[model samples]
Target chain A: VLYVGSKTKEGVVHDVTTVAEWTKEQVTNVGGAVVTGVTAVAQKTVEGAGSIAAATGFVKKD
Target chain B: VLYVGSKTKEGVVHDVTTVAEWTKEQVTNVGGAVVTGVTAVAQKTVEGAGSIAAATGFVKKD
Candidate 1:
């Protein structure tokens, strides 16, 4: 079980598995398919992101 | 060895280790530090993302 280290200075540690699962659900909600590995992680980042549009967010634009 | 299971329809499988290492270097290039696990994975997604600007992209925006 790997943990996410602090991306920001706030020191909010994240469980990788939990984030991945949450992200997967969000992707399904948005009509997307998730594979595994880091894409799962990236999905998680996009799932909770408010600024990015669901239509052209994360993987779509980049 | 975990692999990236095709985010796109194309059968482009990515080695998680290779992607993680490549991402780590890219994050460092943009003056950022990385931890481990999925965050390493997301870093790769962000690192290779051309649409997102390094100055205010990925973690910074989300």
Candidate 2:
């Protein structure tokens, strides 16, 4: 299963499993492929009081 | 000042500013440059309860 994490402007973090499954279009929309094993973390930062920052990591299913 | 936010597998997020300053090698080593203003958001997911997912934002110095 793939794990996805995103953070809100207030420093609150949210996590979702099977990211590739949750938002398949968004994933492929970003030019990423589904693979097994641990995926490297991708980071993003935003400027605002209620904006969002996000990161992603993956673990392959066998 | 820069703001860095990261998420744990438990859906808890952690944030730190000045990530560029805090982990010089880690940032530059990944082939990223320093810039001012707002940055984009990146997302990552973890499978375990103790894993980490992170994101970053920057505000240039005046």
Candidate 3:
């Protein structure tokens, strides 16, 4: 399985994954975006910084 | 492009993404965790749970 983790704007260790049980609400608390044709995941401690991480991830997808 | 969405804790959606092809598994499984180098993403939906839409996108480097 692939594993991805990063820090929130608050410096909290956030983990990312593609499992459905992980849900989407967990991503928006930060400033992140969710694409329709992908199974990506992200997390953040800040209220609107999580999206930043997710966006960064999107640009790197193969 | 960057788009983001969210939902409540229960009956809500969550979306997370990195640029890499979201994988970890082909089907939904139990629990979730992914980490390594900044690129991160996550998602979850309860068994039979529907709607609950949320997603946070990230940008990739290089």
lDDT by residue for model 3 over A1-62, one digit each (tens)? 22234221322223343434443322222322332343333332323322232232232322
What lDDT tens digits, residue by residue, belong to model 1 across residues B1-62?
22243222211223343222212211122323222233232222222232332111123223
**Model 3 Cα lDDT, one tens digit per residue, B1-62:** 22234222322123334454433433221222222333333433222222222323334333
User: How many residue pairs clash (N, CA or C atoms closer than 3 angstroms) in each of the candidate models, in the order given?
Assistant: 0, 20, 61
Error of 1 at B33 (Å): 24
Relative to the true structure, candidate 1 reaches a TM of: 0.17
Evaluated on the second chain alone, the candidates' TM-scores are 0.15, 0.18, 0.15
For each candidate in the order shown, give its overall lDDT on alpha carbons.
0.26, 0.30, 0.31
Q: After superposition, how far is residue B46 of candidate 2 from its true place, in Å?
A: 2.8
Question: TM-score of A-chain in each prediction?
Answer: 0.15, 0.18, 0.16
- lDDT (Cα, tens digit) per residue for candidate 2, span B1-62: 22245533422333423212222121121222232223223343323443333433222122
Worst 10 residues of 1 chain A by lDDT: A20-29
Best by DockQ: 3
What docking grade does candidate 1 earn? incorrect
Which 10 consecutive residues of model 2 chain B have the lowest summed lDDT? Answer: B23-32
